[PDB]
Structures are given as structure tokens and as C-alpha cells.
């Protein structure tokens, strides 16, 4: 039952303040300290520091002194991470892990994503990608999801009934907005015989876009 539950994702502008919580349960909170680990998107793990749950004393690393602060409320068994004057470099996922003997980090949290950007919430523009007017045993279709914010987005084919032969590519940033694409490869006899529909859901803007791939002509 020992688990660490953090807060949800955060969307902040450059210069603002963010506070990340870390709910502890299943054990006596004052028995172990809490660590904080930073991970920039596409990069490795970086140990920020830890805080003693008895003395409330933080211990920061090299590149985490000045704008960072560890705090906790023992009456609620929750540790807090705070970053002041947010910068673009702070855009990362922040983990919390319970400290133990032999200097190990155990019972990690699910991580709290923090995105520092000036971009507003934008619904994705979903476009269908049909192949050129022309041959072959298989045919590849595509679906473009362009210009949305923030993450995540969910893309399915034919409401899930089409799972095999699907390649959904990771979102790529472009002018403070995300862009995603997906490809599906099926036999040449099933399309345009059956209908291939692209399903894109963006919960951040409550958007559910269906998009049939129609042949060019």
C-alpha cells in the first residue's frame, strides 16, 4: 500500500511560480525523507535533492539553488516542490521518491509534468492524408494532427477496430505548439472498400474529431 501520489500536470508562463505536491501513504511519513528528481524531455534523470521529514531541512544539488525550495506539511503527509521565476529550461517531468537505507530511491511517484511556455490552449487541426492517385499489395494511409497545446492527444483508427499496422509518431514542438502524425498500412483490397476513419481526441480543449480518409479525385 506504500505509494507516492503527486499532483497533475502544470502549465505556466515564463516568470511564474509552480508548486508540486507529493502525497505519501501506507507508511509513517516521518520515518523516511523525500527526494526530488528532474527529467527534461528526451534526457536522463537528474537528482535535484532531498528534504528531511523531521527537521524540514532541504539538501540541494549544484544546479538547483536559488529558485528552488523544498517544503512539507507533516499533518497531511505531503512534500512540496516549488520553483520561482520559471524559465524555459525548467520544462520537465519532476519525480518524487521516498528515501531509504543504502541511499536508494524507492516507491517513486508517477511524476508531475511542468511545461513553461507562453502558448495558449489550442485545439488540434486534424487533416486526412490520402495517397497519390496511383498499385501494390498494400496501401498506406495517414492522419495529420497539427498545432495543438498542450499534451497529450489520443489517436485511434476506426474507433480501435483497426489496431494492426499502425504507426503513431511522438509529438514534435514547433513554434510553441505540438504537431503529431500517424500512419496505417492495410491491404489494397480493404481500401477504399471499407472506411478508414481517423479519431483524434484532445481532452485539454474537449475536442473529439473524426476524419474519414477519402480518395483523391
Amino acid at each position: 500500500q506504500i505509494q507516492l501520489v503527486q499532483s497533475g500536470p502544470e502549465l505556466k508562463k515564463p516568470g511564474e511560480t509552480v508548486k508540486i505536491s507529493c502525497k505519501a501513504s501506507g507508511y509513517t511519513f516521518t520515518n523516511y525523507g523525500i527526494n526530488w528528481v528532474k527529467q527534461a524531455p528526451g534526457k536522463g534523470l537528474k537528482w535535484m535533492g532531498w528534504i528531511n521529514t523531521i527537521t524540514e531541512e532541504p539538501t540541494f544539488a549544484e544546479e538547483f539553488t536559488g529558485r528552488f525550495a523544498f517544503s512539507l506539511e507533516t499533518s497531511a503527509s505531503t512534500a512540496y516542490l516549488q520553483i520561482n521565476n520559471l524559465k524555459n529550461e525548467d520544462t520537465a517531468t519532476y519525480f518524487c521518491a521516498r528515501g531509504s537505507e543504502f541511499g536508494r530511491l524507492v516507491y517513486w511517484g508517477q511524476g508531475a509534468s511542468v511545461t513553461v511556455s507562453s502558448a495558449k490552449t489550442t485545439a488540434p487541426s486534424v487533416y486526412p492524408l490520402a495517397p497519390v492517385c496511383g498499385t501494390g499489395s498494400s496501401v498506406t494511409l495517414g492522419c495529420l494532427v497539427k498545432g495543438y497545446f498542450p499534451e497529450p492527444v489520443t489517436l485511434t483508427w476506426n474507433s480501435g477496430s483497426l489496431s494492426s499496422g499502425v504507426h503513431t509518431f511522438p509529438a514534435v514542438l514547433q513554434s510553441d505548439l505540438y504537431t503529431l502524425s500517424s500512419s496505417v498500412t492495410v491491404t489494397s483490397s480493404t481500401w477504399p472498400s471499407q472506411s478508414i476513419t481517423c479519431n483524434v481526441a484532445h481532452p485539454a480543449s474537449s475536442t473529439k474529431v473524426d476524419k474519414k480518409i477519402e480518395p483523391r479525385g
Binding site: 517513486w108 508517477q110 487541426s125 497519390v132 509518431f169 514534435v172 498500412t185
Partner: protein
């Protein structure tokens, strides 16, 4: 503070074989080193602590050794659920430092990429946009280059690339190269090609179309 460097960021090996991950330290850390596993979904769990000792719940196929400045994580036989990124962590001195990380990937036979080019959607053109998407699916190894030629001229600016992780089933890779540009820039030419240079072929794979 101590610098922890894992000399190999990427590592390929077949399933069922023995794999070893090296972890070097700038100074002696007296066997005070731990190992962590981060699954592709993001979850992090402890595997080995104090060089050799396994953690509770960790399969017996895992093991750790080394002393002084050089340490290693070893899997007797590689399993499909072991495909993840492994980080080493020292704790001899504060502050604690993680390694660069080593991503484990499965080795397979070389495969030629299936290239597919897609002209701008008619719906996108009505909004002033014109993204030329080029798919390169199911290939091996991971290394591959894409070249965009427009009317015979190489286009290097405005290219958006995305690579997927190693495929769960056939252990292949895929890339999505998009040529993002406006409708005006699109209607200035007509010959849009997508060249794919790969290990499996001496001559590049070309996919093109026209605005005809």
C-alpha cells in the same frame, strides 16, 4: 561532485542473450552505487542497490558487480519486459548523481524502409497551410537519413522529423518527415520528392508526386 558517465547511451542485443551495462565514476565510490530501470512508459523502479544486492521483487536474472570506479549491471537472459533505459546512481557523497542512461534495444535482421509521400490535404489548403508528409515505416537499423528535393533543389529548411521507439512486435523503427510550409510556398513549385538513404540499399529510395 562526482560525474557518473555511462559510455554507451544505446545498446543492441538479441532476446535471451547476456547483456552488460557499464557505469564509470570520476572518483572511487567504494561500491556505493545503485541501479534503476525506467520503462518506456516512464515508470521508475529500483533493481540493484549497493553494487551487488538485488531489491525485493527484482527477478533473479539481474545482477550487479564492480568496485572502485567501474561497475556493471548484468542480465543473464534478456526478456521482452526488460527493454528499458537503465540509470546508475552513486550515493557515496552528496549530492547524488545519476548516470547518462543506457537504452536497451533488440537486434534483428536489416530491413528496408517503406516510403510513402503525402501531398497537402485539401482541407489544409483552405486554411493556407500545406504540409508535405513523408512516412518511412518498418526499417532496421535505426540510423537513416531523409532528403527533401523540390523541383530538383534540396530543401533543408522547414523540415519536421519524428522518430518512434523500437516497435514492440517486429523490433523495427519508423520515421515521419514533414515539410511544413504555407500554400504560397507550396504553389511556387510542383515536383516534391522524398529521398531515403539507408544501410539496406546502395541507391536511395525515392517517392515523389506532382501538382499537375
Amino acid at each position: 561532485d562526482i560525474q557518473m558517465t555511462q559510455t554507451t547511451s544505446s545498446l543492441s542485443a538479441s532476446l535471451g542473450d547476456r547483456v552488460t551495462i557499464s557505469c564509470s565514476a570520476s572518483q572511487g565510490i567504494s561500491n556505493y552505487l545503485n541501479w534503476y530501470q525506467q520503462k518506456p512508459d516512464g515508470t521508475v523502479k529500483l533493481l540493484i542497490f549497493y553494487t551487488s544486492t538485488l531489491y525485493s521483487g527484482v527477478p533473479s536474472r539481474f545482477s550487479g558487480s564492480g568496485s572502485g570506479t567501474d561497475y556493471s549491471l548484468t542480465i543473464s537472459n534478456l526478456e521482452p519486459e526488460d527493454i528499458a533505459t537503465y540509470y546508475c546512481q552513486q550515493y557515496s557523497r552528496f549530492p547524488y548523481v545519476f548516470g547518462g542512461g543506457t537504452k536497451l534495444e533488440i537486434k534483428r535482421a536489416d530491413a528496408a524502409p517503406t516510403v510513402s509521400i503525402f501531398p497537402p490535404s485539401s482541407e489544409q489548403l483552405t486554411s493556407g497551410g500545406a504540409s508535405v508528409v513523408c512516412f518511412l515505416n518498418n526499417f532496421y537499423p535505426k540510423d537513416i537519413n531523409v532528403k527533401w528535393k523540390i523541383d530538383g533543389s534540396e530543401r533543408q529548411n522547414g523540415v519536421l522529423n519524428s522518430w518512434t521507439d523500437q516497435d514492440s512486435k517486429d523490433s523495427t523503427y519508423s520515421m515521419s518527415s514533414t515539410l511544413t510550409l504555407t500554400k504560397d510556398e507550396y504553389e511556387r513549385h510542383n515536383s516534391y520528392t522524398c529521398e531515403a538513404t539507408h544501410k539496406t540499399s546502395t541507391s536511395p529510395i525515392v517517392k515523389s508526386f506532382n501538382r499537375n
